[PDB]
Ligand binder design. Structure first.
Ligand SMILES: O=C(O)[C@H]1NCC[C@@H]1O
Ligand SMILES: O=C(O)[C@H]1NCC[C@@H]1O
Lengths: 262, 262
């Protein structure tokens, strides 16, 4: 194992100003293939934790998979999440999202924090997601798309639908940011679909508004998304509506994987 | 009126090599607003020529609208189409396609020539379309997307659906290029979504494979598309299945608008 990875001051400034940031080539192909293979196994035996008719999402895999439980403690990831949240951290949510070639949905503009505040009891937006690129993310395979700086407009009052947590997981969403709001935000800030090669990591703020469109390429777009939360900002488990595999309840501070002979 | 517009040798080379080409800022805002206003009138009274539940397409407007009949003979357009097709030309098809803000469909990969050969009797791919930008075309408002150089692989054998011309106009298409074909083409050539400001013109070859995704922006994307065909390559009206407003039958060579006091 190396020195723990840190963002440079420039990277940090870029992250806070925009609310997202791509580090290119964090993992190699061999590491990425190990993650691809484990993701396929979870898609195949995830059960109620899966989302679809062909499988498209799985939730909570770091609680059940040894590979994924080590991934979240990796020295390429955990220290940056400590650095950005300025705290010890733990994993609130883990999920894999594949958009297969010539497939996919329009994911309505939204803020993760909005769901986590109302569904899970997250007190403050002191959280972020790391989306590992299992495939090259381009213009055409349905990249996550953001309003840069749009996290600074706090949580935005949103159109609310559904009952329970049934449509938290699906592309028609329970909390969709208004059309009139979006225009203002976008007139003001613009739109960015960060791109990069396989093995890249895209860090994004819990309150950044984001969306994506379908994949019109012949290449799949697999993403592993790890949502780190600050231990100080642990969710209020008394207001909690959802289960462990969507919203974690073990708030033990994580420590990084140590170098071992196995 | 000016000297007639021509592409530079570089532009022409770029067009033939890639099969598409954007000229920026061909029309001003005032010209574009005249076209917007006329398009709204056609969307409202086009009748059977319209396509939808909210209006999204209209076909054949240059046969019914004085503004649109002059547009096709404009010295910003007609001479480039002469230049690229190396012939006198006429309009085979005219259509307006709006993708409203937060709206739109995935348009499956396709080749226009494939439809025009089989539906209308077009002997050779000696045709092209000029798509005038009524709005700024960006990454996020569903730009027409192309395989550069993909016109040189001739007409590609395609999956065929429907009966009649019912699903020629709609986003699930009668002639959809295969998934396996596309991957090969794309592995080989890549993908480009030409962009530009309002009043731009995007010229593209009749055989270039193209597609688009929905508009996830708060801005509309209106396009006027004029399909010029070579007079020598006029359609065989004996194999013709569709009506005047989809496939024209007056093959008179066009001449440009002359400067008049009105
Ligand atoms: O509902 C959730 O918790 C997740 N799915 C969409 C928004 C979050 O990422
Ligand atoms: O069917 C047509 O003739 C037109 N619509 C889709 C392909 C062409 O542009």
């Amino acid at each position: 194992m190396e020195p723990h990875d840190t963002l440079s001051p420039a990277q940090v400034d870029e992250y806070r100003k925009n609310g997202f940031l791509v580090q290119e080539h964090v993992f190699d192909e061999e590491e990425i293939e190990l993650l691809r293979a484990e993701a396929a196994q979870e898609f195949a035996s995830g059960g109620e934790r899966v989302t679809v008719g062909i499988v498209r999402g799985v939730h909570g895999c770091h609680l059940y998979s040894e590979v994924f439980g080590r991934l979240v403690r990796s020295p390429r990831l955990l220290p940056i999440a400590r650095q950005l949240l300025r705290d010890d951290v733990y994993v609130h949510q883990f999920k894999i999202n594949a958009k297969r070639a010539f497939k996919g949905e329009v994911w309505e503009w939204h803020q993760d924090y909005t769901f986590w505040h109302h569904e899970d009891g997250m007190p403050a937006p002191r959280a972020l997601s790391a989306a590992i690129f299992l495939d090259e993310v381009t213009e055409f395979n349905g990249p996550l798309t953001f309003v840069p700086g749009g996290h600074g407009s706090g949580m935005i009052d949103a159109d609310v639908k559904g009952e329970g947590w049934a449509n938290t997981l699906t592309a028609s969403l329970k909390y969709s940011l208004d059309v009139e709001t979006m225009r203002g935000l976008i007139e003001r800030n613009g739109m960015v679909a960060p791109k990069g090669p396989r093995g890249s990591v895209l860090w994004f703020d819990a309150n950044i508004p984001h969306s994506s469109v379908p994949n019109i390429s012949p290449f799949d777009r697999g993403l592993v998304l790890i949502t780190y939360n600050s231990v100080e900002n642990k969710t209020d488990v008394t207001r909690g509506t959802r289960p462990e595999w969507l919203a974690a309840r073990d708030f033990t501070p994580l420590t990084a994987l140590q170098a071992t002979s196995f």
